[PDB]
């Protein structure tokens, strides 16, 4: 009886608005007092003489999981792959934050601690160069707190003898997988009050860290000079979120700070000026 | 109840100081059972006159002494019957009692690992396409001392870097392994009963050496009395010792 | 092996898909959950909490608190306009406001609005207001009487000092868009019905403030991308 | 109709998005009342 | 009940932590004697006052099947192809070893004895040194000992009447497949002390003999200069050990010994000095 | 044949995927396993046995056996520091010893400690310890008052050699990071509580030696690979 | 809720990961106790 | 009871060796007479005195189904493709016969008769001798006796209106299928002791005509010179065999014949000299 | 269409698989079996009939039928030997036997193996011979005294011209290497036992064959390709 | 455990390989014996 209701999108609704009938008394809903902090309680019926209205309407997509359940780019990683005995570069390395890219950052701070596992998707895109490609395979390794860096295409931890990696060539589908949620406490902070041990770096800095996405192209010495664009996608699923916070009102500057100003530039929200208020 | 009296052979040992005992692995010594087998001929199996005491040649324990190590089968190749069936069959299984006895004085403190080692592959002592020599491995009862000297023959010898655990692990971690300490001011004896442990049922007593004795002392020996030199004795018993495949004495 | 057919759509990735996928930390065993006071499970939770409208948009209050309140005068007797928004709830003045930057992350609108008004003034100040939504087809009413043949509520300045009143969703069709552009979904307007009356030595002019929420009508459908926020430049690393 | 769904996968994260349950406020946000 | 226990990761659970109180006695739990070989029994409850805390933590992750049961890379094979009538070349031969690779090595080595099945994954990459690639397809060919091997991309060999064989060709997905534990004892050694039967060869060179993997290029001779470097990659899937040994603590030198030392290089271990150690 | 429609990750080689796979030696069967002692289950099998901790790591003791005991003295008569150590499992010190090797093949942490201590010297010589862990958000004590004001044992030397004080785990957060870098997990500090006390003719100094473990509380997470090891060259065949 | 597991192959190996059972220790490595 | 008891492999056991006793007797097991022509009885427990082991080894891989069950190369047809207007040629025809490859050949050959279904698999290579390769399908059509062999990449035959072909194209992963038993007889002749109606041709050549393998490459003309070459692989599915045969002690010469002889060669079995049978 | 995900092996032709794969025939209804004497189920069937071994393998005999003969002489009084063996199974010169050829097709080793003697003398020639295997990790023996301790069979030649002995699996591992190279499964070897006696007038010299079968107890595992056969050139068509 | 298996296909031959069934001799190679 959920496989058929979830299926027409129904579970979830709204209230029927009922009928309503002159009103002459002492009882005065419309009257409140909103220093109290509460919300007013009134509703449509108890202000004007209203209809039976049956409200057929859903909040299902209006959900968290609904929200956030939808992925987003995160990051985009370019790698300029020369050939410079080809082994001394030719890797990406980036910490992980949903913090450098604007349209998702700001839908996720719409709260102030969240929950959830990942969906990452890539997209990768081989930009050519030379004459052609040839077979450019590509590795995604996932290098936790603590786990050795990569310095070079060349490098042992490419090895991935217990991290997690994934490969792309061309021709392939986009790769995705599934990450559980990786916090070391009950939620991830999307805002921090606080500094570190050394009373330095206020912010969201201090609290996930994720550690790093490095990228390697792994087709040995070859012609062609290309460039590989992987784009990073994020879905959140299975989602709860705590403590709603008004929406980012002003353009990003940094990741993990809240900083707004910008130099020689007019802070600018996105409230838009009328000549007078007598007329909209 | 810090006494222990073990009986083997026809050969008993006591000590009066002693750390409870330890069983390697939690397992006592076992005949081969019918399920495990591989060779199907019937082994032989000596009892009291295989089974029993063997004590080797004592070794001298000083302020400069940083380590020893003996190999077994090996140590017992020349050991009385256990000896003998040794070389007469391809085949044999044993467990072992080892009983490791250093005393001392009230007056003197040190400290000693005894650890039990299974399949100790030590390194070899340079670099490059060495490797160790059959020799070097199998000493008999006289084990190796750890030397500062230069050595007869280098490229065939093995590292004398016993810290190392000579296996280029860290010792300190050699703990993993079955083992007791024998710490001066505490005990006398220590004590290590194995079970026989290799991935095949039976294997050859002349070319594979199951355990490896190392006793390192990870604390000098000190002390203001005039002896201020001590042995430290290894004696140790076969148990359920058994042997297949006979034929003439491999020399 | 299996028999199988291809279809339409395969190797394609859609944004708005959920499908499995192999998790990389296979046998990870994630924290607690704990009690967090304040979860949201649903985004009209937001919807539905009084949000202060930017009423006084002029370029002379913009980037100050004065943006968020009305003045009224002692000065006049008069049927005067006071000032007037339009109802739509993406729309400006409106859309900064809790209730419009969420709507701003959808296509599609219906419901009741609960514009909700506290006076700020001395409490021996008093004063009789009009206010008034002026359903669409029409213009923006230019005279008290025009406003007031409309949905409207008398409000007594009093003991309480807020009052609520409701823009009933009155509309053709079921839903509205939330970006409508020509179309409207009417004004609120609001006017003098007395006077404001002081005494000797008090304040000759007070405020008023202005408030939005949604009712258990409301409901938002078609997940876009948000109007209300860009990114020009880069985000610092 | 209804619909099929079975999960594949030995890990919680692997399985897709959620079913939805009610809103059931309480009114924590709008009415956190002291004495209601 | 286990299909759901496993799906949240809960079979296999740590303890919980109870409420503990002054204690006054001629009982001494803090007191014990390490010579004994056995490590203390000493919970926290014992030496100080604890409080009830319920603990959600799980072991699973630390299970031999989780530690082992990552692929990485044991072994790479390097193909130059040449065309001097390129039928008397163009072969891989390898002797198969989990010990050329030190990530993986490491790990087991943390074991005297294990047992277990394998699942080889291949990631073959062309490199180009031509205008082009066109067709390459390449043959892996398991070749036990005794078996006839192979010495030219010609012999008969690669027919792999009962041999296995598995093929790859460009654009085609990574091979993978699984192999049965392979020993001819009850268990893999990692270790051994011990000969052959002439006295020679000190350690693991005589256990596991496993003989070789290897590789050609099947397509027929063509135009283009490639490289094709293939990585062997290797799971362990259903796994016991036994006998834990102490982790390697120095470079490895060389496969099948311990040898740790190297020419004019200090011996250097992971150990990291202090000035003085009344300050951490 | 069944239509059927491709997922994103279709493909990809994951390292840390479990799927089925054709087997190579088809009707092969695997030799008998037997009986060997000491078979391993899992990890933490190891991280619950005692390993010595290189407490000594100064240059100048470094490669020798010495870098694993504590130098105790009759000389000094007096609340002096004798050693300290980073809690945290992976750092170092410890990160050399059982416990932490394996603990730097996960990237979290979670438990109590078991530090445990020899006392090597004669027979006859006698000393009270203090053995002192300070918990995080503070500096490494310097003084005895400083220390003992968090959790300690007062150790006394006499007929048991041995004695083992733990570490709660006393953290924010349910767990921690193996390699934390900035963040600490507290210290353990020794001192002496009495003095070290001789007869006539013994030895005036004597060793401390020192062991971890974990208690039944331990638990690790997240594996990833291990950087107390690595490959410079490459590998002789 | 739970998850699907078939094994499609007609060899051991080629099964997919092992399920997991208890510790169950004995305590062989921490204590081997010949007198408890 | 057997998806189980073969998964492990466990089907077809091979017997325990019990515990024997001294024997004292007139019963001389032992002693036979090998002139019978029958093998001797004696087991291990005649001769000696054994223990008792329990045997959980098993024959499952020495099955009939197991060794002739694995593909192996049976021919190598190259096409070598000309642009002399292009439809004169640039055709295979293969006359089909488990006889001119050596390793699977020798396999059957241990054999008087066999039957079994076929699981003919296909391994196309095009070898790249221009610039570039563009789109190449490949057709291989069976054509049985009597049906119209095809005598140009032109004619009808390629319209195979009854026949059975399957189709290639670069990029398409390796062809397979499946053939039915296809002998006129109950099985098919590894050996045949008789001639022709006419009575030449001595062998094999009389029984077992299965007709011809035919290919042809079916794009278009076009520019590029290439040459492709398609191994074929066959597995026996679902096997008997009759009245076992000693192996081939010698290189194969000739298909359908059993000759041995070589020219100008000396006559080269397997068997190893020794210097004197008084040392191993 | 279902949605499907792939996985790595795909699109890869492993020899040593099994899957279905359409029929090219269909309908097609294959032959009648029938009866034909000698079915083979299993190849052990094979392995378990006598052959005989070249047990003269010098370059002198070779490629005669003299080969597999070895000749005793009335001419010795003495503890000679008469010949040796390698007993592994693949190994020279016993390969080129029934048992040997099929074990050559596979890398695994393991059972009992039949040794049987007939003696080709005049019907009134008499000897008796030691028959002896001596076990591996020693060299093959050089005396009568040194083969005799270790298992054997003394045949007294009389009415039966035959005897069989059997070296029993005597082995480290449950399983050997069919071609081990360095390692070795121990020898067979042939002994005068008292002397070869004859009457007047009958042939001094006598011949001796040798046969091999396996026991009950044989079995071989994991198939590779031969190591007694080859393909130089190409085949004729 | 044990494993899945169904045939796909209309004709015997595409059917996978078959299964084992016991050696169940007779002798008639090693003795095929006329009085026995
Ligand atoms: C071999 C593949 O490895 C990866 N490729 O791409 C990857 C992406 C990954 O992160 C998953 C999503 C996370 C990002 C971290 N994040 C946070 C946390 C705190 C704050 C304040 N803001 N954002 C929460 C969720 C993890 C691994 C890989
Ligand atoms: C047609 C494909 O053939 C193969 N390609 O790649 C392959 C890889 C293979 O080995 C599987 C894993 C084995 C490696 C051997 N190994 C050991 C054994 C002993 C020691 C001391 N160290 N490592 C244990 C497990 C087997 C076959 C192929
Ligand atoms: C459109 C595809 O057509 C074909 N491509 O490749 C093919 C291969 C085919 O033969 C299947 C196996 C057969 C070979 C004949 N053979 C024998 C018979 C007698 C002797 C003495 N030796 N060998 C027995 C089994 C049949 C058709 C095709």
Known sequence: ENYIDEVLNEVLVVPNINSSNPTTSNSAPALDAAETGHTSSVQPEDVIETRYVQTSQTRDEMSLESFLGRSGCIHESKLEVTLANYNKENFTVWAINLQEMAQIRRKFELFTYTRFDSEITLVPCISALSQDIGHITMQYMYVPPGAPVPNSRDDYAWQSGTNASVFWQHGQAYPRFSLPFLSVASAYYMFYDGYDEQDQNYGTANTNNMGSLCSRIVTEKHIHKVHIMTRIYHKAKHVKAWCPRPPRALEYTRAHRTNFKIEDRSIQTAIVTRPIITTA | ?251 | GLPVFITPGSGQFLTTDDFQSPCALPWYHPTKEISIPGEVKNLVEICQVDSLVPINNTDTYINSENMYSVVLQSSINAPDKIFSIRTDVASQPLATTLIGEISSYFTHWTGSLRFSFMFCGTANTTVKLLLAYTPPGIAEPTTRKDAMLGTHVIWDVGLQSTISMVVPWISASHYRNTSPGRSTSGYITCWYQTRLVIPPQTPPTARLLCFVSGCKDFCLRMARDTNLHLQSGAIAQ | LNYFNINYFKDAASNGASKLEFTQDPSKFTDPVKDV
């Open chain 2, 1 to 251: 109840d810090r006494i222990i009296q073990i009986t083997r052979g026809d050969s008993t040992i006591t000590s009066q100081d002693v750390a409870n005992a330890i069983v390697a692995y939690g397992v006592w010594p076992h005949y081969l059972s019918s399920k495990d087998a591989s060779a199907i001929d019937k082994p032989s199996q000596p009892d009291t006159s295989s089974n029993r005491f063997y004590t080797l040649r004592s070794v001298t324990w000083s302020s400069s002494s940083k380590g020893w190590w003996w190999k077994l089968p090996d140590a017992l190749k020349d050991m009385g019957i256990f000896g003998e069936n040794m070389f007469y069959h391809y085949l044999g299984r044993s467990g072992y009692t080892i009983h490791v006895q250093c005393n001392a004085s009230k007056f003197h403190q040190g400290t000693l690992i005894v650890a039990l080692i299974p399949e100790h592959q030590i390194a070899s002592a340079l670099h490059g396409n060495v490797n160790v020599g059959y020799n070097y491995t199998h000493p008999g009862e006289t084990g190796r001392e750890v030397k500062a000297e230069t050595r007869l023959n280098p490229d065939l010898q093995p590292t004398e870097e016993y810290w190392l655990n000579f296996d280029g692990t860290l010792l300190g971690n050699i703990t993993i392994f079955p083992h007791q300490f024998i710490n001066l001011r505490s005990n006398n004896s220590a004590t290590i009963i194995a079970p026989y442990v290799n991935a095949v049922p039976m294997d050859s007593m002349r070319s594979h050496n199951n355990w490896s004795l190392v006793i390192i002392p990870i604390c000098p020996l000190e002390t203001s009395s005039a002896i201020n030199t001590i042995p430290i004795t290894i004696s140790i018993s076969p148990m359920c010792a058994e042997f297949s495949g006979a034929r003439a004495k491999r020399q």
